[PDB]
Each structure stands twice: as C-alpha cells, then as structure tokens.
Design a protein around this ligand. Sequence first.
Ligand SMILES: C[C@@H]1CN(C(=O)c2cnsn2)[C@@H](C)CO1
Lengths: 412, 412
Amino acid sequence: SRRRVVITGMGMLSPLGLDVPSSWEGILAGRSGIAPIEHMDLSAYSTRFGGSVKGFNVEEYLSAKEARKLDLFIQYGLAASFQAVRDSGLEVTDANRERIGVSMGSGIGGLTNIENNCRSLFEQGPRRISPFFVPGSIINMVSGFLSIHLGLQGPNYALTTAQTTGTHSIGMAARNIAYGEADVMVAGGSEMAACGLGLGGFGAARALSTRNDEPTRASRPWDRDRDGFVLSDGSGALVLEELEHARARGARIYAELVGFGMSGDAFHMTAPPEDGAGAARCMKNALRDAGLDPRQVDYINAHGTSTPAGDIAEIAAVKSVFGEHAHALSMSSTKSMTGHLLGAAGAVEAIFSVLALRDQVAPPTINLDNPDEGCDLDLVAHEAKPRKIDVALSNSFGFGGTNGTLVFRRFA
Amino acid sequence: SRRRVVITGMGMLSPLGLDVPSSWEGILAGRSGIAPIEHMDLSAYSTRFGGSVKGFNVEEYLSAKEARKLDLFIQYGLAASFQAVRDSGLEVTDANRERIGVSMGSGIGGLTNIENNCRSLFEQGPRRISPFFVPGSIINMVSGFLSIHLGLQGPNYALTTAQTTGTHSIGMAARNIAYGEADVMVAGGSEMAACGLGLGGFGAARALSTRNDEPTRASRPWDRDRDGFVLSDGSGALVLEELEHARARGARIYAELVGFGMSGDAFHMTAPPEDGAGAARCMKNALRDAGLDPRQVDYINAHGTSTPAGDIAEIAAVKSVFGEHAHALSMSSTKSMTGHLLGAAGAVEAIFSVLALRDQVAPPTINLDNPDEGCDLDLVAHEAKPRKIDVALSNSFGFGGTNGTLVFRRFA
Ligand SMILES: C[C@@H]1CN(C(=O)c2cnsn2)[C@@H](C)CO1
C-alpha cells in the first residue's frame, strides 16, 4: 500500500511577482512578465527579452554575506522554499527533523556564477576564482542550504531533468512520502539562465522567439505565428506532506497529489515526436498511478512552450489519451504569460494547477490569436475561464525526451 | 509490495582503465591512476595533477560526428552505460522498452564545454556559441542520449548531489524497481571537471592536495600527512534489475542491492561534522532498510576523500554505528588509487563493492603510511586483503551535507 500526499505550503518567484498570490493575480488577469532584459548589452544577440524576476530582495531571506556566496538560481530556490515552509505553518522539531527532506532542482544551474568566474579566470588567471565558486554554483545547494538553515535531516537530493526538473522533483518527493521514507518534503525547482550563456546557448540552437519588437506577444503557444520559447527566471517550491501528518497538526490543505507519471520519448535530443507518443505514455502512467479514468481530468496545465513541434505534439498526445473527452477538458499554457522557467517551469505550473483547483478557474493561454492546424481543443484563449475542476494535470516534456506528469485533485 | 533488486551488468571508465576488469586489476594490485594532467597548461594552478581517463576512444561507442557535440562527461557516461548494458546480456524489445529506464547523474556536468563556450562569448560574441551548447552540456543528457541510442522508454532522469551523486542515482534507481515503476534501470554517474574552472574552483577553496611533486602519493585517506582530495574523471554504470525478471531470462547476477540510506547533516555547506553524525544516521537507515544486524557488515568502501575533516568523520561514524564490530570489518578507500571522481565516485565505488563480493577481497587503501590519531580500524593499508565478505557497504558524503549508503550482499 501507499500513503496519501497533500500540498500544505507553496512559494514562488516568477516574472509576474515575488510570491504566489501576486504571480497568480497576474496569471488570472492575462498579464505578461516578458520584457527587454536590463543591465546587459544584448546588441549582438538575436533575442534581447525574457521573463526576469523584478525587485527580488535576497536580504529578506539571507544576510548580504551568505547571499554573496550563492548563484541567483540558488537565491531564488531558497526564497520559494522559505515562502513554502512559512505558508505550511510546519514546526521542525527534534521529534520530526529526520522525517523532513528537500528535493529542489535546476535544469541548467549556475550560469551567471560560471560567467563571472570565467571572466576572472580568462582575464587574471585561476587565483581570482571565488573560494565559494563550487559550493555556490552546484544544483544541490538549494537542498543543501535549506536543510542547514531549517535543520532538515530527511532525504536531501536534487534532480536535474532540464525543462522537466520541477515536475520530477515534486513527483519523486511525493513518492518519498507515499512509501514512508519521509513525512514532509520541500520540492520544486529554480532557474536563472537569462544571462549571456542562456540567451546565447538557446539562441545558437535558434530555439528562442526573436520577436524583439513585441516581447509580450513573443510567447504564443499553439498560435500559427509562434517562433520558439521565451527564456524566464524564478522558482517554485511546495510543501508536500503525508495526509494523516497534515490532519494531526491542523494544516491548511490546498489539494492532494494523487498521480505521478514519467516516461522517455527515446526519440530526439531537443524535439518531441510529432504524435507526442512519449507525452501520451507519461499522462497514461500518471492517471494509472492515480487510479483515474482519462474522463475525470478537467484541467491540463500544458508544457506549451511556444515551439512549433512541441505545441503540436502535446495536442496529439491529449487527443490520443483523452479521445472523446479531449474537447471537454480545458488545457492552457501559462508560459504565454510567464515564459519558460526551464527547471522551475514544472514547479510554478504545479502551483498554478493547485490554484486552478482552489479557485475553480482555468488560466488563459494569452496571444492565441490564430490557433494552428489541429489546435482545436479548449486552449482557454485570451481570458481566464471559471469552470468545474476536480482533477488538474501538469505536464513537462524536456530535452532528452524526458517526460513528467503530475495529477492533483480537490481535497475535502 | 517491495521487489528485490540485483546487479546484472557493470561498466566503467576510470583513471585505472577503460573498462571494469582493467580498472579492478589496478585496484587489486594497489596501482595509482594519478599523474600530472597533460590536456591543459596548469603552471598557474596550485594543483597540476589528477586522475585522467587515459586513451579513451569514443569511436568504440559513438560516431566522431556525434561525439564532437557532447561534453566528455556525457561521452564517459554513455561509454560506461553501453558497457553495463552489453555486460547484462539484456535485449531491448517492444515488449520491455517501457519498463527500462536510466538515472545517470553528475556533480557538475559539462563544465569544459561551458568554459569553452564562455571563452567564445567573451573573446568573440554570442554568434560563436555552439548550437549544441545546451544538449551537449546539461547533466540530464547522459540519460537522454542513452535512451535515444538504446530505445529506453522507462523513467528517465538525473540526480546531481555533488560527491553523493553516483550512490543516490543507484539507490533511487533501485527504489524505482523495488516499487514497480521499472523492471530495469541503468544507473550511476559520470564526471569530467578537470578544466580551468574545476581545478581553479576547488583550488580557490584549498580543498585539493597540492603534492605536485609526488602525485601518486597525494591521495592518502586517514594518513596523518593528507592535504586534500585528488580530482579524477570517469564513469560507473550498473544495470539494476528486478530479481524475478533477471531469473526469468537466466541473467548472470553479480550481487543483490539490499539497502539504501540517505540523510542530511544539516551542518555546513562543505564541511562534514567531526562526529560523523549524518554519515552514522545514513548507514543506520541503510542497515535497517536491508533488515541487517550491523555485525553482518564485512566490508565498507569508504568515501575516504583524503581530507583532514572528511576521513576522521567517517572513522567516528563507523565506530558509532558498529561499536566493537568496527574492529572486525574491513574498510578501505579506493580513492587512494582512483582519486575522487566526484559525482561518479559513488558509481565506480558501488562497482568495486560488488567485485569485492564476487572475488572475496577487500581492496587496499594505498599510501596509508602513518594512520592519523584514532584511525585504528582495519583500513586494509597498502595491500588487498582476501577475506569473507557476505555484506558490503559503499558510503558517499557531499557538499550540502548530503549522505548516501548502499548495502550489497552475495546472491545464491
Ligand atoms: C544520438 C542522436 C543522433 N546524433 C548523431 O550524431 C547521429 C549519429 N549516428 S546517426 N545520428 C546527434 C543528432 C545526437 O543525437
């Protein structure tokens, strides 16, 4: 058998806001967090815009001195995590600290730190590399620093599954609790790759929208005029908790995590198969895990990156899985507003899926002006749609053909 | 209910050999793989030696056209994975490809590739960044490329827990199989951090031995004259397989994976606590997981990094866990010979633990000329010790206070 897992705390930094409620308010209003990137000469770059976190104050969380040791992606991870633990009301004690763990991940990790230390190295040689370069740049330091700060002695690890990281981190944390390896986990992801290396790296693959004249219209999932994804920064953290543990302390439960699916496409390094066979296996795995019929799904938070082949693969996968129910569910890409937070995408989109359940509303796909060939599902174009949502899916489909699906259900 | 997990295939690149048998012959002969580094000019660095893979031929595994796109850590990971799969005798079919997954991790991933593309960005511009920069550098792409080449459609992910990566990857892959998420997993880790940023970064932390004039004597775990770890490159992969699945196809079984432990120190970003409290909690978790009396433990492949604080913390942990039995078991650090393969350390050392079971021999801790204060266990100083080994334990500890323990035993 298996224990039930509930969500009792959420935290976030996104292009829409410095916490969950501000980000969510932007989502339901169809606001874009996309704009030209500042304090950087992007003259020679083919993309000059993305989703930056605006007005982040790390000194609300850490001393200036501890913040100087950590890459931005680690700072963002810690902010989301501290928000989530505070939101949960959880009290860490000597009696439970061995039962509380962390799995906060990243897709690309410390590019900003790698950049600034390469500068030192190339200009001045290796003796000018920061002593904290390694511990301050590696992806497991969100989990590391969080565990040290809060005294968490439970499972301590980090996933890195590129654009699937957040979804996998949450799913595998849910497994830790379900199979009795932990009673509580902080899980999700963080990313800051809106540096030269991220813009330059994705730019050289020609994977980014180049709609520099109108950055807010760049991210347009399933629209016939999409030309690639928008690079964005931020973090998402959830407090996952065994149900009886949540009930005993009188926690506020947002939703239940009922299903987790994984699959591999085994197809291509960056592109999905046209029919999204892998994404279909992954969703079917997640519904089987939850013991749910495809007919019971009401809302899907799509991966919906605004890549030509990715968006169309997801339509095919949803039609394949849901058959005569594919048109009755609502599916939206909040990446139309947030851009693509890569490893943090699945974390912020799990939070948006939980809030869709709490508020009984499907977030919009903004910029969906002319749906492409066969994009004829309910994609919640332009404006938020109040509706019945008992079951929400959140999908992530990343480089290496790695797939994750989370299934959340209303809790009463 | 929980299924049994066996090892049916193993693969390796190490400083001692281009496969498992050649690496193991070096381990048993007390041979060092440590030498001045030849692939770059280290005259400005305080450490100029490490464990390099010597004469790696990627054209034993991959077309030169493909290899040119991939960081060395991906090449090394794919080579070890290919070896492990061939060694298993497993045939991938339409009937089982959904049940076979991959979890190959890395501490740092494609630092060489990121450094080289940062040089292009700074000296020329973004137009000179490689189109293959992201899929050739990010940590999840061993799992990705392996799945694409062999057609593995099962769980596809990657851990990054610094120096604990290989142990966590293998343990969590075993849990996947134990709980029914997969029947077969390819699991382990790979690392190639021997570039300017890696040697410079660890150098800036003063974490490395600076014994440049006697590289083979630099790695001296528990020796009173140790002065830091020796940086090494390579990969380990194991094919983990559900027991009945292995029995049904007549697989050769090397050993059974009976126990997996994790814990967080919640102590310090980089320093292990002197009392080894987190390592002790981790080993106790693993022994309880394996249903064992601690007196059953015959052999411990120590983390044994040759740091002052790391080596003494492990003695304290082993004494605390095993009490008087700590004087009867054998504990050795193969890092005395291989150096520290970081995220790959746990993977090669899991392989060495299994071969310790197959051949009934404890590998030596070379260079243990003057055991330090309180390092008075059987540390298999200088020479391999033939002995009875029914149960072998492999320990890993990493930055962020992250701990892993694997427990293997003979299969009958
Ligand atoms: C493994 C796939 C295919 N590949 C090749 O270089 C290749 C080699 N033989 S046929 N194609 C790159 C696109 C990497 O991803």
